[PDB]
Design a protein around this ligand. Structure first.
Ligand SMILES: O=C(O)c1ccc(Nc2c(-c3ccccc3)nc3cnccn23)cc1C(=O)O
Length: 437
């Protein structure tokens, strides 16, 4: 494979479904490089657990935790970190109300080079235990020699785009990492970076972030095919925001419109949204407590019942993970028979305006509340016109490992979306328990 897309290990499935999967101890092992220092961008941290995932010989190397916590939450994280003198913290500014730092990324500086890891798991035991999570591993980027003047840039502009994403924090600890990235050669990178940062973007900046960033890349580096109207869009996520009183408000007017972009020229396109049903959660490996990481509140859900007619069940027989609830987020553009895809995105961005952005000021300004990061796989970046879909995820240079089943299966009439803050007392989960919030 050229794609370097991995799932995390799932405890309790047969070994065949974990053979090419990665645990966090694998990613941080000395087999991957001799660690000098690391940056951990995330939302939630268990610092005691995290330090134990580093190899003992690397446990005192510097670690930077990049978080978005404020007030007492910030104090609690600082207290978790205080016993470890090698741990520094960087608070990402969140100057727009109701934003979140969702970006999940590792920057790993070695003796031998630099590696970037963009993934979907929080840094807590449960997110690496029995969930479906996604990981993109960069190549080992070599250092650029002293006195040598090279760009170190890839055809996808990844090096410049990653630096631009870090510059948006305006943080001194991250300027140190920007300088590290400048000294390394990232020219082998074949993915495009798609980030979200908080702000109000107009003019030349409107294309930098969110769903307009995705639009721009698809216009510039994908081509339209005949019968493009028949190629569905698939979105798959773990949380749902307030989308408006009907689909024309945002979902099918600016979000879907960005997602269906192909090529530079100028809807009936089917939209499939995959989100766990109550039954999915009840019968999962973790049972109802998996629903503690699928935050969709009844307050949000009751205002947009129209949306649930787009929902399809989580199913992942191809990767043995139908009962490993998804915390990965993915978006993709399959062919009408789901045998090919025009592109694939793995990201931290959920189905929400906060993450992808919402147009303001008569369509001239894109407002984003949150930090998000993901990587886009475009066939053109691999010398191809489209990717074949891999039949079984764990069973070549042109065959993409989609981690769940296609076509997605629509909710049955008795199915309901998982809503995390109402009780389920009608049938017990795999551990014999009910759910009472
Ligand atoms: O990706 C995801 O599914 C996700 C969803 C929500 C996240 N944070 C969060 C929570 C919350 C979540 C879990 C336990 C307690 C509180 N509540 C809110 C309310 N508004 C905005 C954000 N909120 C974080 C993530 C992530 O994993 O980054």
């Amino acid at each position: 494979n050229p794609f370097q897309f991995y799932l995390t290990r799932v405890s309790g499935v047969k070994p065949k479904y974990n053979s090419g999967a990665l645990h966090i101890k694998d990613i941080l092992s000395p087999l991957f490089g001799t660690l000098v220092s690391s940056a951990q961008f995330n939302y939630c941290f268990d610092v005691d657990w995290l330090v134990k995932q580093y190899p003992p010989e690397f446990r005192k190397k510097p670690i930077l935790l990049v978080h978005g916590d404020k007030r007492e939450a910030k104090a609690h994280l600082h207290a978790q970190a205080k016993p470890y003198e090698n741990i520094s913290l960087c608070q990402a500014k969140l100057d727009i109300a109701f934003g979140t730092h969702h970006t999940k990324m590792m920057l790993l500086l070695y003796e031998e080079g630099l590696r970037v890891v963009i993934h979907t798991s929080n840094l807590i035991h449960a997110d690496w235990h029995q969930k479906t999570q996604g990981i993109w591993l960069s190549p080992l980027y070599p250092r650029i020699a002293d006195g040598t003047h090279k760009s170190g840039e890839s055809p996808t502009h990844f090096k410049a785009d990653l630096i631009s994403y870090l510059m948006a924090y305006n943080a001194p600890s991250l300027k140190e990492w920007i300088d590290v990235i400048h000294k390394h050669d990232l020219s082998e990178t074949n993915v495009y970076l798609i980030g979200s940062t908080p702000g109000r973007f107009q003019g030349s900046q409107k294309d930098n972030w969110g769903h307009f960033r995705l639009k721009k890349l698809l216009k510039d580096h994908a081509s339209s095919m005949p019968n493009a109207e028949s190629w569905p869009v698939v979105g798959q996520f773990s949380s749902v925001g307030s989308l408006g009183a009907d689909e024309s408000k945002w979902l099918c007017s600016e979000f879907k419109e960005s997602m269906l972009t192909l090529g530079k020229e100028s809807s009936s396109v089917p939209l499939y949204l995959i989100y766990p049903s109550v039954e999915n959660v009840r019968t999962s490996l973790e049972g109802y407590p998996a629903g503690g990481s699928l935050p969709y509140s009844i307050q949000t859900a009751e205002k947009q019942n129209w949306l649930h007619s787009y929902f399809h069940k989580w199913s992942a027989e191809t990767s043995g993970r139908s009962n490993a609830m998804p915390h990965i987020k993915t978006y993709m553009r399959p062919s009408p028979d789901f045998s090919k895809i025009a592109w694939f995105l793995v990201t931290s961005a959920n189905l929400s305006k906060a993450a992808w952005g919402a147009l303001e000021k008569n369509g001239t300004q894109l407002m984003i509340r949150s930090y998000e990061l993901g990587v886009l796989f475009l066939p053109s970046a691999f010398g191809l016109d489209s990717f074949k879909v891999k039949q079984k995820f764990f069973a070549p240079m042109a065959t993409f490992p989609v981690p769940y089943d296609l076509p997605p299966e629509l909710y049955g009439s008795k199915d309901r979306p998982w809503i995390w803050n109402i009780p389920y007392v009608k049938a017990p989960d795999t551990h014999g328990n009910m759910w009472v919030p």
